[PDB]
């Protein structure tokens, strides 16, 4: 198939607050894992007709991406800090889903999944 749209990234029915949380989430987990060398595949959404992947959208129905995880941190898409630790949860999920073991990409996810768990081991408390 083509691309689906990319997630929603903003949510006008939906109020929004600043938090330790997600503030931390933004500046220090998002921000360090962004920056690591192994982050450009999933600094977007995986465009399957560039790469010629026409069965990721088949298998994967619930993609998700730092670029869509950035974004609904800069305009506020999430009220709860959970919200955004499964985001990144289902990015690499779905990574391990598609993909096969001793893949170059799935290689590449478990670097960022445990500088993940290393950043968010250091996440503020709630409330
Ligand atoms: C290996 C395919 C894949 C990617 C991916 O994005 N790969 C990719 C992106 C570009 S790119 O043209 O889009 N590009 C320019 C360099 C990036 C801006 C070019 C080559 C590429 O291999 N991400 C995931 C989660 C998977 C997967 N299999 O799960
Ligand atoms: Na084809």
Redesign the pocket.
């Known amino acids: 198939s083509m691309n689906p749209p990319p997630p929603e990234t903003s949510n006008p029915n939906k109020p929004k607050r600043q938090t330790n949380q997600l503030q931390y989430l933004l500046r220090v987990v998002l921000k360090t894992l962004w920056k690591h060398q192994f982050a ?5 959404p ?2 399957a007709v ?2 010629n ?1 026409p069965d ?1 959208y088949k298998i ?1 129905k619930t993609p998700m ?1 730092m670029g869509t995880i950035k974004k609904r941190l800069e305009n506020n898409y999430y009220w709860n800090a959970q919200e955004c630790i499964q985001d990144f949860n289902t ?1 690499f999920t ?2 391990y889903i ?2 096969k073991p001793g ?4 290689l590449m ?1 478990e670097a960022l999944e445990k500088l993940f768990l290393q950043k968010i081991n250091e996440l503020p408390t709630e409330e």
């Open positions: 450009w595949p999933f600094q977007q995986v465009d560039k790469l992947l990721y994967i991406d990015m779905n990574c598609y993909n893949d170059d990409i799935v996810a």
